[model samples]
Target: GSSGSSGDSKPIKVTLPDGKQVDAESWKTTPYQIACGISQGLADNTVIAKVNNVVWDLDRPLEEDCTLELLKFEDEEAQAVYSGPSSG
Candidate 1:
């Protein structure tokens, strides 16, 4: 679900696993934006996001100071599923 179209905005801190944090605003900043800030490659390979230990969408706006983790398909934490036909 998408966040509200318009609402209060406040500066929020997004912390990465490496102890690096990025500045952002509530209801305006998204995980994708933060990922891109780090590197386009990270933004591209990310299949899922972990925000404060909760599964979050890449496009979902952050609402507070929280921890953020980007997961790629190769990562064991990745939540993406492949349901296509499998070779037998």
Candidate 2:
């Protein structure tokens, strides 16, 4: 579902996991909230999120409407490398 439209002159665009874009006036809700809306497991294990390429806390709001990507253990390539250092 779309987040609806903000009547503000300057609207921000929020991109969801499914590639849907929603315009939000502000990022009042936490990333976890958005993640949860996408999936329950996503909400439980969300480590951090990126807002405009900046790593942000899961509970932080977006300063401006922008693309959102949820990062978890499964997406941690660095961690995978760390665990299997000799694998190359």
Candidate 3:
């Protein structure tokens, strides 16, 4: 997938789960890949990711500059699971 933003023009901004931002050519790679590069723990626990408020697959290449947030197992939102009577 060619993530390169227009021509060899400007760089794109990628935000990490910790609110860290990185500027690079969009053709570089996906946010998930970047997260993995930052830490193995992030790669292992990341289930899904949100880009520009849209749910995206871990391997989906970012088409443009946008905010990225990794959803991990420990994330409060991700940990909210409901149990049923069958569990008893």
> What TM-score against the true fold does each predicted structure earn?
0.72, 0.58, 0.63
Expressed as tens digits, the lDDT of each residue in 8-86 for candidate 2 is 3345577875688766546466566777776567677766677776676665666676778776644533432213236
For candidate 1, write residues 1-88 as lDDT tens digits: 8755656788999998578888988888988889888756878777667779777777778878998887765455444533334683
Clashing residue pairs in candidate 2 are none
Question: Candidate 3 residues 8-43, lDDT tens each?
Answer: 544778887677887645555776787888757867
- Candidate 2 vs 3: which has more lDDT: 3
Q: Residue 52's C-alpha lDDT in candidate 2?
A: 72
Off by over 4 Å in 3: 1-10, 73-88
lDDT of 2 at 85: 38
Q: Is candidate 1 or candidate 3 better by lDDT?
A: 1
**Winner on TM-score (1 vs 2):** 1
Stretches of candidate 1 exceeding 4 Å from the true structure: 1-7, 74-88
The stretch of ten residues in a row with the least summed lDDT in candidate 3 is: 76-85
